Amino acid sequence: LDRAFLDGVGFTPLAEKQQQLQLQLKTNILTANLIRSAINGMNTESNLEV
Amino acid sequence: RIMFKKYDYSNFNEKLVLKGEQMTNEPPTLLATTHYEEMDKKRIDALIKANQRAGNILSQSSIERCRYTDSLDLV
Amino acid sequence: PNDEATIKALDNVIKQIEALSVIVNRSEKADDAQILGPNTYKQLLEHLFS
Amino acid sequence: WTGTQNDLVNVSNHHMAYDEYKKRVAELQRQGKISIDVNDKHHIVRVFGDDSTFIMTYDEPPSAEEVHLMCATFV
Secondary structure, eight states, X not given: OHHHHOOOOOOOOHHHXXXXXXHHSOXXXXXOOHHHHHHTTOXXXXXXXX | OEEEOXXXXXXTTOOOXXXXXXXXXXXXXXXXXXXXXXXXXXXXXXHHHHHHHTTOOOHHHHHHHHTTTTSOOOO | OHHHHHHHHHHHHHHHHHSHHXXXXXXXXXXXXXXXXXXXXXXXXXXXXX | OHXXXXXXXXXXXXXXXXXXXXXXXXXXXXXXXXXXXXXXXXXXXXXXXXXXXXXXXXXXXOOHHHHHHHHHHHO
């Protein structure tokens, strides 16, 4: 029933989230901050099932 | 228009750095707006003097075309 | 790409702040104020009869 | 010493011209034309041999026809 009724999903794409993270975490590029590196490899192909 | 940082005219050693652009329709307020006719007549007389001794190059075309030079834009 | 997408926000946050001194310092700042002018009452329509 | 002499003479008469241009501008201001509140603060004269330039700064920028009036008065 949930699958049949919950048709779409609402979320913000990755680009905006990365921009916000960059603005909030004002750090020079070329410094190897793993907080920024880890998120850069994400995606939301699977959001409906989750 | 090209925008620069404020420049201190007093210190000769001062340098300029560029900062951005802005589009503007205001024509530059140079001189010759007061003496527009005095220069138009002068240049047209120079051109007709050159043409009269020359091979009759249709002065009407020259007078019509010389006015094209100031209808340009900085883009 | 994130840098290319955030440079526009940076350009806004710097120009829309530090270049507004140019327009602000321009003469005839906002509008007329503190100065009043003459006026008169406006007649209405009555159409009386006896 | 040709360049030194040229720049010494060029920077000399500029001061004497500015001195009387100030008087003429003050005359126009008391009558109704350039208007008050259009007064320069720093003026810098730069001389390179014969050629020379004159730069004057203002707090409130005069309108377009004011620039023509003051330039004509100076010239």
